[PDB]
Design a binder for this molecule. Structure first.
Ligand SMILES: *C/C=C(C)/C=C/C=C(C)/C=C/C1=C(C)CCCC1(C)C
Ligand SMILES: [Cl-]
Length: 209
């Protein structure tokens, strides 16, 4: 099982999700889910073709992964913000916090020296602030909606919080960090997480609709 095989698997999974969401497509929600998995599909194909594998010191960094995350994770937060009924100002805070996490990870991965752990730490701090907004203010806000919408928000929120919290550990234990986990295992774990936090996320929304 090679890296390219794992990338192709993620590509196929994202593509199936993309077509499923487009078919089922309230247009805003369905269009967002197409963007979430559609962008990831492209990133995985590019990586499957061997494009964007950047050598850094003694590790290999996958640049398309971080461009993907920077564009798709704010769309996931946007989806959750619509469910919770955020005003346009609360959106700005959480999307700003999200972008800090994603940019810090991208920069830390691309830096060869130990300064990269300083960048990782900053993303960790901003992530804790993002979790606070999901579990607190956004949950208060979602409470004002129908019982079914509130229930859907809580289920997507917990899926999001629990799984997103695993990524920094995979990053740190993998090549970008202490380089303990091997690239193949590290990639396999992230392909699984990407698929669940995007396509699984999406199908839980379809089921409730
Ligand atoms: C579809 C892709 C998803 C949901 C990716 C999520 C990625 C994260 C939650 C990554 C978080 C990170 C930290 C909290 C600190 C810095 C390193 C990151 C980017 C792995
Ligand atoms: Cl990486």
């Amino acid at each position: 099982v090679g890296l390219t095989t794992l990338f192709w698997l993620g590509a196929i999974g994202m593509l199936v999700g993309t077509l499923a969401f487009a078919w089922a497509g309230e247009r805003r929600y369905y269009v967002t889910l197409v963007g979430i998995s559609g962008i990831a599909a492209v990133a995985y194909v590019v990586m499957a073709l061997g494009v964007g594998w950047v050598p850094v010191a003694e590790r290999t960094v996958f640049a398309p992964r971080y461009i993907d995350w920077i564009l798709t994770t704010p769309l996931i937060v946007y989806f959750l913000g619509l469910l919770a009924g955020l005003d346009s100002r609360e959106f700005g805070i959480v999307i700003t916090l999200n972008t800090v996490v994603m940019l810090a990870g991208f920069a830390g991965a691309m830096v060869p020296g130990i300064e990269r752990y300083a960048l990782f730490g900053m993303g960790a701090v901003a992530f804790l602030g993002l979790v606070y907004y999901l579990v607190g203010p956004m949950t208060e806000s979602a409470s004002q909606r129908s019982s079914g919408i509130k229930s859907l928000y809580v289920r997507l929120r917990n899926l999001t919080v629990i799984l997103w919290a695993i990524y920094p550990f995979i990053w740190l234990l993998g090549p970008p960090g202490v380089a303990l986990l091997t690239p193949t295992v590290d990639v396999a774990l992230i392909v699984y997480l990407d698929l669940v936090t995007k396509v699984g996320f999406g199908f839980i929304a379809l089921d409730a609709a």
